[PDB]
Structure formats: structure tokens, C-alpha cells
């Protein structure tokens, strides 16, 4: 039993809700919140910009030190950093950004990072400003993640489409 509330159950291990991931994380304080990161951990917009804003820019400060030490992430890769005031940990995961010409096949590799964590709050990878079809992202999630994932979809219209189109 966990404290996530109001989710629709899609499969044994995948759950979905129309919610603002920032407000969800503040309420639940999950062990792991997933960020829709880029390889530079520049959290300028989309989910990343919203999560970073909610940390009063502390996420960005920590991220800049991480990059200065380690260099950029790989597309499809991840790193674990602090969750600040939102969660114990933040798993920064880089899905492909179609608006950069990145291989959509890397989306499965990106979701594989979730399997290193028993329970996660997450957005759909490569959705929104990363330019992929959120319906496809949900399919890859369900077919790749085996741990317990609570998906937050900001747009109510899109949420209804993902559910009503979910196979
Ligand atoms: C990634 C996508 C398209 C669906 O998960 N968007 C979001 N989902 C949840 N919280 C969010 N906050 C800001 C944007 C956003
Ligand atoms: Cl977005």
C-alpha cells in the first residue's frame, strides 16, 4: 500500500492520473520523482522547468555541479540527484527530443531506467515539448517498465485520450 490517490490502473504495474506533477510530488513526497531532463540538465521549460521552479532553482544549482563534474548525460540515460522539497530523490531521465532529431527508438532505453526503482512518480517521457506522441510514450512505458509507476499527465484532454485509446 502506498499514498498515491485517484489513479486509474492500466496494468498490473502502471497507473495514470490527470495531475500537475509538481503538485503531486509536493503532496505525496514520493521516494522518486522522475524529471523529463536533457543531457545538460538545463531545466528551462516543460516538466523540468516546472520542477526546478518549485525547488526555487536548487535543482538547477545541483545539476550544474553534476555536469561540471561528470559531463552530459546520454540520450536514453539518467542520473539520480536530490529530490529537494519535492521527493527524496529525483531521477533525471533523458528521453529523445524529436524537435532535435533524436532517435525515437531511444525511448525504450529511457524507460528502462525506471526499473532500477521500486516505485516512481513520473511524466510521460518525450511527451510535451520533446515532441513525441504521448500515446506511443504510454505504450512504451507499459511494455518496458516492470516496477510500479504512477504517471501524471498535465493536460486533461490528452489524459482522456490516453485512457480511451489505451489498449
Ligand atoms: C510530460 C507531459 C506531456 C505528460 O506527462 N507533461 C506534464 N506532465 C505532468 N506534469 C507536468 N508539469 C508540467 C508539464 C507536465
Ligand atoms: Cl511538456
Curated annotation (Swiss-Prot):
Q: How does it sit in the membrane?
A: Multi-pass membrane protein
Q: Which residues form the Macro domain?
A: 1-167
Q: Where in the cell is it found?
A: Host endoplasmic reticulum membrane
Activity regulation: Inhibited in vitro by GRL-0617.
Query: Result of mutating residue 31 to A?
Result: In strain: Mu/B.1.621
According to UniProt, the reaction catalysed is: Thiol-dependent hydrolysis of ester, thioester, amide, peptide and isopeptide bonds formed by the C-terminal Gly of ubiquitin (a 76-residue protein attached to proteins as an intracellular targeting signal)
Tell me the function of this protein: Responsible for the cleavages located at the N-terminus of the replicase polyprotein. Participates together with nsp4 in the assembly of virally-induced cytoplasmic double-membrane vesicles necessary for viral replication. Antagonizes innate immune induction of type I interferon by blocking the phosphorylation, dimerization and subsequent nuclear translocation of host IRF3. Also prevents host NF-kappa-B signaling. In addition, PL-PRO possesses a deubiquitinating/deISGylating activity and processes both 'Lys-48'- and 'Lys-63'-linked polyubiquitin chains from cellular substrates.
Provide the assembly information.
May form homohexamers. Interacts with N protein.
- State what protein this is by name: Papain-like protease nsp3
Biological source species? Severe acute respiratory syndrome coronavirus 2 (2019-nCoV)
Gene behind this protein: rep
Q: Fragment boundaries within the full protein? A: 1025 to 1191 of 7096
Amino acid at each position: 500500500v502506498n499514498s498515491f490517490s485517484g489513479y486509474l490502473k492500466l496494468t498490473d504495474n502502471v497507473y495514470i492520473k490527470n495531475a500537475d506533477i509538481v503538485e503531486e510530488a509536493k503532496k505525496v513526497k514520493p521516494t522518486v520523482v522522475v524529471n523529463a531532463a536533457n543531457v545538460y540538465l538545463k531545466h528551462g521549460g516543460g516538466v523540468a522547468g516546472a520542477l526546478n521552479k518549485a525547488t526555487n532553482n536548487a535543482m538547477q544549482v545541483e545539476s550544474d555541479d553534476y555536469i561540471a563534474t561528470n559531463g552530459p548525460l546520454k540520450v536514453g540515460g539518467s542520473c539520480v540527484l536530490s529530490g529537494h522539497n519535492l521527493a527524496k530523490h529525483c531521477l533525471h531521465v533523458v528521453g529523445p527530443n524529436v524537435n532535435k532529431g533524436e532517435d525515437i527508438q531511444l525511448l525504450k532505453s529511457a524507460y528502462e531506467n525506471f526499473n532500477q526503482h521500486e516505485v516512481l512518480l513520473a511524466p510521460l517521457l518525450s511527451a510535451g515539448i520533446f515532441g513525441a506522441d504521448p500515446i506511443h510514450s504510454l505504450r512504451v512505458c507499459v511494455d518496458t517498465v516492470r516496477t510500479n509507476v504512477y504517471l501524471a499527465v498535465f493536460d486533461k484532454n490528452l489524459y482522456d485520450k490516453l485512457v480511451s485509446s489505451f489498449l
